[PDB]
Structures are given as C-alpha cells and as structure tokens.
Amino acid sequence: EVQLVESGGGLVKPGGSLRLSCAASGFMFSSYSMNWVRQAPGKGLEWVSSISRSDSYIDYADSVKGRFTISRDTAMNVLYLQMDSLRAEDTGVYYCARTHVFNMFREVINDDYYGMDVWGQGTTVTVS
Amino acid sequence: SALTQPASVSGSPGQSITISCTGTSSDFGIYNSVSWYQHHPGKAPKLMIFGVSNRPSGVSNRFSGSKSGNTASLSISGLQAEDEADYYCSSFTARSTVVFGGGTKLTVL
Amino acid sequence: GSSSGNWHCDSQWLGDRVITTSTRTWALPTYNNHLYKQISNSTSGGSSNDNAYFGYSTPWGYFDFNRFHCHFSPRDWQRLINNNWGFRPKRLNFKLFNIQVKEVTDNNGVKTIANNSTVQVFTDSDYQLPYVLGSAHEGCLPPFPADVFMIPQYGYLTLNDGSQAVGRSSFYCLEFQFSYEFENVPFHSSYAHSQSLDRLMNPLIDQYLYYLSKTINGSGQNQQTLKFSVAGPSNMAVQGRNYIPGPSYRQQRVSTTVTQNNNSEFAWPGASSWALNGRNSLMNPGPAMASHKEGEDRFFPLSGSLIFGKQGTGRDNVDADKVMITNEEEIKTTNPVATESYGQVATNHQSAQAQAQTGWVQNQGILPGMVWQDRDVYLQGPIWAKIPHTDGNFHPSPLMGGFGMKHPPPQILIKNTPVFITQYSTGQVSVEIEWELQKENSKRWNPEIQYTSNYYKSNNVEFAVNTEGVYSEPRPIGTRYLTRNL
Amino acid sequence: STRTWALPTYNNHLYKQISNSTSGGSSNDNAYFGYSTPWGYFDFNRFHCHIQVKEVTDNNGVKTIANNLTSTVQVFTDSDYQLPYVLGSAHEGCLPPFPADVFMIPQYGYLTLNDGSQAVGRSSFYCLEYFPSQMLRTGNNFQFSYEFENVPFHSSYYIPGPSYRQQRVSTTVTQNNNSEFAWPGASSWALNGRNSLMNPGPAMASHKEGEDRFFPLSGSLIFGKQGTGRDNVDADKVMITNEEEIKTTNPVATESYGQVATNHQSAQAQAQTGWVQNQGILPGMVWQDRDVYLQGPIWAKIPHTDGNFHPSPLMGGFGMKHPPPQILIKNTPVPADPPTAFNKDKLNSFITQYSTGQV
Amino acid sequence: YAHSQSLDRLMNPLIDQYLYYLSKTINGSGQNQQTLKFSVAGPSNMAVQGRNYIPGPSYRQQRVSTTVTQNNNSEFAWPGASSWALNGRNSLMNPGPAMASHKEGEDRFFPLSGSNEEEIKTTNPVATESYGQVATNHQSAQAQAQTGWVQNQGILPGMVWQDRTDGNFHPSPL
Amino acid sequence: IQVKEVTDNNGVKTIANNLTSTVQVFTDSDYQLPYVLGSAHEGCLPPFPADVFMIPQYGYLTLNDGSQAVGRSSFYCLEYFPSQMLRTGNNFQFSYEFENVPFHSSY
Amino acid sequence: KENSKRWNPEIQYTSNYYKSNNVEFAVNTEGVYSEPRPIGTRYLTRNL
Amino acid sequence: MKHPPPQILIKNTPVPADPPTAFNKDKLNSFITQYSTGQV
Amino acid sequence: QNNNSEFAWPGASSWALNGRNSLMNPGPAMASHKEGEDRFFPLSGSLI
C-alpha cells in the first residue's frame, strides 16, 4: 500500500502565491523521482515540474518555468511546489506522481523512460 | 498537446477498441517511453502501459498496446462498464519533459 | 563419412572452479582471392594524419573468442557475479573438427554447391605474428549457441609515415585441437566497496594529530595568528589519512539531456587525448575513474565509458537510445570522478604582501600510497589482452578491463587451400575455459544487491529470441554487486 | 608491556545508527553515516606504548561499587579482517606511555557509504555479535600470537621523488598574510565531490636548508603537548615535527618540483617554461619515506584493492596487507529483574556494570 | 632492438570494433540544434578507437634546431632548459626520462637537455611535445568545452615505455 | 542415417546425397527441458511398420498472461545441451530402465 | 542445488539500491532492529 | 512416472550457403536446403 | 471497493468442530489472487 496525498489547494486571487505539499507514505521517499502534473478544468492532463532522486536535476514545463519552485524537505517525507505569480490558467487539479523504476541500481547511464507509477487524488487550486 | 489523440471513442460491451495517439518529430517515444494512463474522474490516474507495450503488475490483461511507426495505439479487449474512463498517452521527450495527449473518453454503451 | 567430434556446450560448477564449454558453427570464405595485398589510407582517401595506417591484408582467417559472452550464458553470468568476489581463467582447451569443403559452380544462370581439398590451420605459440585479438574487434563467437558465424579476415598494421612505408617496417608471410595454460594473473575483483577511502575513520574517538584551524583572530589589521585544533568527528575532512585516491586524467562531461549540452560540436575538439609521434589518439576509455558523482545519473564522461550498442543498431551516427552507455559508479569510493579535478595544490608562497592562491589539478600520475580499482568486465566486454613487449610497464592490466598477460592465448589462423576455384568450408568450433573462483566470505548482516530479472509483464523475454528469431541482449551486465570492506 | 584498563558500558549495550544529521551536517565535506557499537577495542598501535568485574548501584544518595563474580567479558580478534579496520587512522585511545597510568578503552564505531546523511543501498551494516568470541569470567584469561608479514626495514639515517605542493606557513605571525587561509589555501584531494584535506601528504622535506621557521601547512604531523586543549590552542601548545632529514633525496614540500618548457622556440617565439606544481612518478625517481616518531603510529592496513603503489602509509610506519588483528571487547549485559508477566519486548533494564584487568 | 609497430596502430585494420564513440554533439546550423549521435569506431577513423595501453610518461624538453637561423635570438640555454629543483638548488634535467628525440620527418630538431632516440618513438612520447590534452571545465549551455595541454605526466596505470633508499620506480638508470 | 540436399536447377528440383553432413541427437536424461511427450500429441511412430513418418517439431509453452510473458518465463536453448553429432556412418544408441510402477489392471 | 539449464537470467532477491534515512534489516538511531518486509523463499524456477 | 523415458531431440546441423567474401558480423541467414532420413 | 458492512466474522470461511466455529486460517495452500487482482487478498487465507 503506497500512498501520496496532495494538500494545500485553495482559492487565491491572481498574482498571489500558493504552496502545495505532497505527503508520501509507505515507501522510501528519497529513492524516487517525484513530479507534479496539472489538469485544467475541462482539459487533459498536463505536466508541471520534476525533481530527481538526489535533487540534482530540477525540470520545468515551458509555461510555468520561473514561476514555480519544486523542492522536497526530506526530513519527513513530503514534497513542495511553490506557486508564485499565479495566472488564470493555473486553475486546475494538481497531482503528485512518482516516476517508477523497477531497479534503482542503474546498469547503464541512459535508461529508457518508464513513466509515473503512484499518483495522488490531487487538490484543486482556484484563481479568481 | 503535441500528441494528437481522438476526442472520444465508444463501444458495446464485449467489443475490442483501439485508441491511438500520434506525435511529431523524433521525440515521440524517445527511449522506450510511450505510456498509457487510465483516469477515472475524481480518482487517481493509473499507468496502464509503461514502455511501448509492457504493462505493469496492477493492470489487467485486457489492456494492450503497440507502436507502429509514428503511431502508438492502446487496444482494449473484452470491454466492460468498468473500463469507462479517460485515457491519455504520454512520451518522455528529449529535454526530459513528459508530454500528454489530449485524451480519449471511452464511453461503453 | 565419420564425424570427427561431438557437440559440447554446458557449464560444470565444481567447488571453486567453473568449466564453460561452447560450440558454434562457422564458415570460412576465400579472402583476397588468395593474395597478400598491401593496404593503407591512400586506398581509403587518407583524409587526416591521425587516421594514417599502413599494413597488409592476408587471406588467412582467425578465431576470436576473446569476449565473455562467448563462454557464459546470461544465467551462468548471473550465478557467477552474485556469489563470487573474483574469478580468473586457469586453463583453455580448443577443438576444431567436422571439416566440410563446399565448392561452388555457376552453371547457366544458377549456382550449384557440391562437396569436394584441404584447410590449413596453425597457432602462433612463439608470438612472432602481430596480435590483433585484444583490440576489441568484431568477429568473436556469437552469444547464442544456435547462431552461425563467419570467420574474420586477418590483417595487420606496422610502421608508417603518412601512408608511405619506412625502412624499419615488417612484412610477415604466414606461410585439430590444442590446450593452453594461462599464466598467473590476479583475480578480477568483482565487488563494490561498502566504505569510502576518505571515511575509513572511527566516528567516535578523535585523532591525536592537530591541524591549523584559524590563521587570524578576527576582522582587522595585524590580526595574524596560529591556532591549532584536534582532528575529530566534528570536522572529518581534515583528518590525517594514510592513503589517497587513484590517478585521474580528466574527461569532458556530456549530459544525456540534450539541452544541457553546449550548442556546438565539441566531440573531437573537446575530447581528452594523448599524442604519439604527431598522431593524436583519443583517450579511450582511459584510466579507471567513476563516471559521475553520487546522485548524478544523467552525466557521463565523454570518452571514458565502454559504449555498446543494441541489437539492430547501425554503424554510423545512431541515436542516443540505440547505444548502451555503461556505468562505472561502483568505483567512486576509491577512485576520482572522471569529469572532476583530482584536487588542488598551492601555486605560490604566502607572505605579508601575497594571498594564498591555489589551482586545480587536472591530471595526476601515480604517487606513493595511492589505491585504485580497475575497470569492470562486462558480459559483452573483452577478456584478456597482450601486454606489449617493452622494457617497462606499470600495472599492465588493460584499460578496457580484463586480465593483462604477456603470453595470452595464441592466435588461431585458418585458410582454405587454393585449388582458381570458388570454394568455402564449414564445420564446428569448441572452446573450453576452466575458470577459478574466489568465494564470498563477508559477514554483512543485511542483504546484498543481486542481479535479478524484472517482473513487469512484457511481449518478449530478456536475452531471448523474438518472433523473427533474432537474439538480442537488452542491457550490459557488468560485475560488481557483492560488497566488501575497504 | 602491561597496563591496567577499565571498560564501561557503551550505548546501553545497543547498536545505534549515527550520522552528521545528529550533529546537523553543516558542510557536505564532513558528511558521514555509520554505526556505533557497545564493544570496546584495544589499540597499542603507537610506538611509545612499547579480569575483575564490578557493579554499581544507587543506594540512598550514594553509589556502592561491588564485585560481581558471575558476570562475563566477551572478547574476540578479527583474524579474517571481516570488520572495518579502525586502528589505522591514528585515533586516540592507545596504551599510555608511562606504565603507572591507567587508561580507558575506546568505543568501537565504523563508517560506511552515504549520500549526504542518508544511506544508499550498497551500505552494509555489521553486527559484531555475529562473530564468535570467547567469554571470560574473573578467573579466565585470553591470549593469541600474531606473525607479521615480511615488511622492509625502516630506514633511519636518478631524479628526486614526487611532490604535491603545500602552502607555506611561517611560525612568526607577522610574516604570514593577514587573512583566513586555513581551509581555502590548503592542498586537497577531492573524492565523490567531497573535498578532503591532503594530510600529511607525500613524504617531502618541510623546509629548505637554512629556513627552519617555515613549515608546510598540512605537511607535518602535529603533536599536542601534555594538557593541550582540544580547540584553538596556540603554537607553543603543539609540537610540529620537521622532515628536514630527507631533504637530500626529496623535494621541499612548499616548492615546485621543477620547470618544463611550455612551447617551441623560434625566431618569432621565445623559449617559455612553466612551473611543475605536482609531479607523479617517473622512471628513475628515488625517494625517502616519512620518518616514524616515538609518538607516531606503527602500522596501517593496506586497503584491499586491485592495485596500489608503494603502499607504505603516508603518516608513517609499516604498511601491511594483513596487519595485527583488531581486538574487540565488551561486558556481557546482565538484565535486571524481568516482569512476572510475559512481554515480548526486549529488556532495556540492565545492571550498571564495568570491569577491569590487565593487558 | 627496435619495434616494427606503433602503440596506437596495434589494431586489426580490416574489422570494426564493437564499441561506439560520440560522433556528433550538434545537428548543424544554429540555436536549438543539439543531439547525441553515436558511431562505431572502425578502420575508417582510427584515432577514436578504444585502446588498452597508453604510451610512456613525459617531462617536456625545449626544442632546439640544428639550423642556427631557426633558433630564437636570445640566451635561452639555461633559462629555457627544463630542471628539477632540490634543496632550493635548481638542477638541469639531464638527460631526463627516456623519450623520442623528434617527430617523424624532422631530423634537425633535438631536445635541448635530453641527449638520436628516434628508435623509441613508437611507445614513447616525443620529448618536445606535450603528452596530450585534458578538459579544464564542465561544458553547459552557457560554456564551451575547454582543453588545456598536459606538459608533464607521471606514471598512469597501463603505460608502457622504452629505456634509453626506501623506494624507487623502474630503477634503470638514465 | 542418411542425408539429402535439395537444389532447384532450372525449374526442377534435384536430390543428391551429401556425405559430409552431420545429424545432432541427444537425450535429455536430467529432465531439464519441458517434457511434452505426455500430452498425447500426434507424430508418433506409425501403427503399421511399412509406413514412413515425419518427425514432429519440438516447442514448449511457458508462463504467460494473455500473450505476454511474465518475468518467471523460461527460455531453453537446446543447443546448450551436449549432443552427439552423427554423419552417415555413425550410429546412436542408449538404454533405459523403467522405475517401479504398479501393474496396469485388465479385468 | 539448482541444475537448471535455463538460458535467460533468474529472478533473485535483491536489496534495491536506495537512498533512505535507515538501512533495511539494521538498527535505527534508537537501536531498534527492524525487518521491513516478509521474505519469500521462492525465486528460482523449475519446470513443472 | 517421475522419471519417464527421456526426450530424444534431433536436428540437421545447418550447413550454410556460400558466405560473402567480406566479413559481415551478422549471422549467416542463407543455408543449403537439406533434410535427412534413416531408421529408428 | 469493499462492501460497506461488518462482514469480518460473518463472511469468513470456517470449520465447525464440536459446535465451535473456528476460522479457516490460513487454510489449504492456494494462490492469493488472479493476475492483476493483486490488490485483493483472501480474508482469512494469508499469513499476516
């Protein structure tokens, strides 16, 4: 039983700032990549940002680059997405997923991508 | 965006269904990654297929997939009322981003 | 009309020893229409002086079994790399039999093939020929026993100036079973240290040595002072240590996310290399050094990693995901990272008028008290190499991994005797190497890392044939899994 | 040699993970992860180095120390070298120089792989309880004999040996630059992205002939005088050893090894040279090792590796593939009264106890 | 004796290696073209192939020509010369480690303090040439790959070379 | 043991002895292959001795979910078994001893 | 012993290379030994 | 039976058609059409 | 996915002996789930 629960979604006027947290349980939280995806109202899933296993590589979708900061505390497993300078397009439902790798001991430096493994039910962020 | 996938598909119970999404340039399915997700409204999305056709422990055998040329397709067999959900395809890209298709809502009759 | 041998493939696991037999089916054409012909770059256009070569192509074919997966199944490699801290090839036995000569006739517009002729074969046990085996060439026995392979042509190189020859160059005119006893070579170390060279210390008690902690009392003028402190658990970087990591020759750092890399063609311009007699040779793979700092999995040294390629991968400019870039992370504990500097040194004398300045060390030779780990052997990688015959050498173990030897297994040269007439031959080949093992004695309480197949449901099984009959090895299996103290 | 020792009870007889996170892990260079064991160990590794059980109770407000004849002391040697080897780092805890002293036996701990303050999959945890050991009461004794492997004589008396330059620090503070260069100006070697000071570094004379005052910043082992403080003690509170004996065959620690031509002369280009700040080994070099001091260590363990060059350790003494084995010791826990009703949990209540004896 | 082979050419000219190298870092043109293209090391390009051994160590000597016009018009005999400093005394390096005297084709150049040695040029680096190059920085989107020359190189694992107290290495005299 | 080869010359096929050919045959007496002789397949020796029969093909099923293979699947390469190679003059023979089993009952 | 001639590699019980606060099958900072998951005995394969 | 009579496996050792006059690392896909007969 | 009722004891398999209903635990050796159903587990039929 592996569970990831999103939190902190709410209603914030445009230009404001919201911090979203993802509380991980049941698995080792520091051994996996973790990343945030976003579903706008009446639209398909969209990807936001990512953070690597050792936190070396932080990635951002082109649209939110520079307005968001992803980071994990790691003292107590949790994930954090700092949303700054929100727009009207940032309304949606934010999910917390973890890319799944069967073996964490790499045998080769370029590994074929396997996609996200565990997801949260997601929280709703609304701007007015 | 960047992955063209039909708006909605439908089928009667028992009938197979092929959902297929297409992509552009090289980065479509770079490395082995073309991944199919099952999103029920209001619940966590599930990774139906990881890789071109490999499917994870949780997924049922009914779901399957293949990629021919520029087109990858999810093939659902033995259709049921519980297979009604949204279906998205995704592919890792050359800049280490993932790209989701618009997604197809499968309404079983 | 009576077979001259049987089919032997199996692995007998006996105590500390292993015996791996392999038999394949081969076909030998006629090369150069039975003619020794000079070759040089002038035949190929001679674009650069770095690519200059001079040598001879010979009609003889030779047998190359020098790669590991010839002798090991994917299972026999797993059984080996999980339970053992070392291995090495005691003996060799090679049998060649069931000779079948097939002559070809073109009659009208069709070609008919019928039986016939002799096939010459010899081994060089005095090492009077060039040695072309240890260079990581193609033509080695196929991994999957049901394949049929073609024998590679033998040709060699010698002294050149441009494409022309020189007075000192040599021309060699080369004009069944045997056994071989390998010379003594140290056990390959298959393990990844559970300690790091800098952390060997006891975290509780503190050293009786002192270091210089503060050179000034505080901000101000004429504040110079000397204050000494104990090296202890608090600051562990400054403790006195007996041994220092292995040598380094730096490589460039290339990132598998193509946006990270600089937007310019630096593949040859930025590559580390060593110059010999005016010809600049790329440094490949180079000394043994870890590929990337811990937690960095997208950065690899540009020319320092054995790069294989996947089944069906083309020869020229194939995509990044069509190759398998090996990982040498296992040796980051005793070896410096390949993309990082070795350290720093002082560049001047401080004084009242001069600050203390330091500068990076981009390469370091051997120093007294260094320790290092050699490069790992891979399922697909080479086994042995010939230590070139020179007045001196240091730590001859070859840089691509495996067992350096001054008398490696002899070359086996074979040709079809000219009768000219269109002719080819076929038969069997068997090679039996007795491997010696070093068992795993460790006291570690918690479970190791092991090489395990993966459970996701898929269309094909790894290391098996698909619907077309094409055998494919999905990933390199290098051996360091068991762990051992430093 | 013979001494009198006293062994307390460490960690309440527990194995406990320790790491920098308990100390906060300020710098990445000082990160560590490891374990701390209740066992103590005998360390005689320094040159100048050459059973009675007690219990304690709290009665009223005073503590009464009584004999315990039935309690035991577990001791074993690691002669297969399966444990981490902590005797080679020149830690404190050695036998005292003067026999009339009585010394305390240091606690045993070992460090292993880490990334930051966490622990990677490869890191391995060793349980010393899982080795066989001998249990000694007040009448039993323990002994064993060791045989040193052949090592070259220590020398007390073509081109010169290698060099890796150290910054030059002068004892008169006026001469030294007025800035904080203790860590920034130090010679280091980087491993896994953790910069580690080069100490003592290769064997090199400390100063040119005639310039006694100057000393290499990390070149020479520094010994504290009797009673010197652990933190920030002045220069007259420490002994700074000089290597000047070896100045003949070895390069000075604070000097460049030499000069090499950096280009080709021509009518249009002058002959240029550049300084060699560090030189590895070349064919033909001869060099002297570092001297051993009455207060200095004797042996080190050569880490088990594919290859090494001139394994003799840098601090001094005799490098050995198999050194004298570790000797581990602990006082077998005697549980207090258990509750009369069964509880599966392990007993955390033990009798306060220590032992003493001879070496 | 003398070698009839060179260290870098020990390969078989007729067969490909099974190893790949990094052929192309840029697709071409400009601004957003960046790609990783791998190729096989083979007979056509023989510089980039993998090799098991690297040549002897070098400590560079200044290049002096026997035609007095080519030489720089200055007194570089002592200042120019390579040296090893001991006890604060600079000492000219003579003859020094064993290295080739000059590159193939130039018989008028000889190392200043290093004496011809042309026989050993196969496994040894030329006296007047650098040992090679080493990258001095991490490339990124913002920085080009830079490589500085290596003027002196001690022993590394797997080297081979030709000839001309507590410890010593390869005691053969110079 | 006899060996033939088949060539199509012009439009017609011609069969001719190949003397140097070999035939590989082994027994699996360690029972390390899948054993398919118990499924009552066709391809047995014929009931009537004047009949000449075709030798069946050997293939084996392993674990599978639908048509896809799980990680527990096995792939046996029969070439990895030592076998005896027979030309046209060589022969192959072995004996076997049935383990003790109860009499079949006819009554 | 397993005499199996299976070509492809077996499944094995491996401790995933992970980064975490604690080491599986070892003590935590308070000295409490812990077993993370139940361990089965069935990994290698044999024909039916 | 727990140890029934063993399986007797047999095949025709492949005899390839003429190989090319230049080395091609690929396995030989061209074989002489062949079959064999005999007695039991 | 579970039924919203207290079926922990009423639902469970049992073997009555001498008038005392006794839960069937763990029971005969049987697989836990169909492939893909691995989220399901038999009520009384697995060691916990």
Residue numbers in the entry:
A (entry chain H): 20 to 147
B (entry chain L): 22 to 130
C (entry chain C): 222 to 337, 340 to 398, 411 to 654, 670 to 736
D (entry chain A): 243 to 292, 320 to 426, 478 to 679
E (entry chain B): 426 to 540, 562 to 610, 625 to 634
F (entry chain D): 320 to 426
G (entry chain F): 689 to 736
H (entry chain D): 640 to 679
What does the paper say about this structure?
The AAV vectors are composed of non-enveloped T = 1 icosahedral capsids, consisting of 60 viral proteins (VP), and package single-stranded DNA transgene cassettes. A major challenge for the utilization of AAV vectors in the clinic is the presence of pre-existing neutralizing antibodies (NAbs) in a large percentage of the human population. The presence of pre-existing neutralizing antibodies in large portions of the human population poses a significant challenge for AAV-mediated gene therapy, primarily targeting the capsid leading to vector inactivation and loss of treatment efficacy. This study structurally characterizes the interactions of 21 human-derived neutralizing antibodies from three patients treated with the AAV9 vector, Zolgensma®, utilizing high-resolution cryo-electron microscopy. The antibodies bound to the 2-fold depression or the 3-fold protrusions do not conform to the icosahedral symmetry of the capsid, thus requiring localized reconstructions. These complex structures provide unprecedented details of the mAbs binding interfaces, with many antibodies inducing structural perturbations of the capsid upon binding.
In each map, the capsid was well ordered, while the densities for the Fabs above the 2-fold axis could not be interpreted for model building. As for the 3-fold antibodies, only a single Fab bound to the 2-fold region, in two potential binding modes, resulting in distorted densities during icosahedral averaging. For the sixteen 2-fold binding Fabs, this strategy resulted in maps reconstructed to 2.54–3.56 Å resolution. The localized reconstructions with C2 symmetry relaxation confirmed that only a single Fab is bound at the 2-fold region. In all maps, the VH and VL chains are well-ordered, enabling the building of atomic models. The epitopes for the sixteen 2-fold Fabs comprise VR-III to -VII, and -IX of the AAV9 capsid. On the aa level, all 2-fold-Fabs contact D532 and Y706. Other frequently contacted residues are T491, T492, R533, D556, N562, N704, and Y705, which are clustered around the 2-fold symmetry axis. Furthermore, for all the 2-fold Fab-complexes, movements occurred in VR-IX near the 2-fold axis. While, for AAV9 capsids in absence of Fabs the residues 704–707 adopt the same conformation in both symmetry-related VR-IX loops surrounding the 2-fold axis, there are numerous variations of side-chain orientations in the different Fab complex structures.
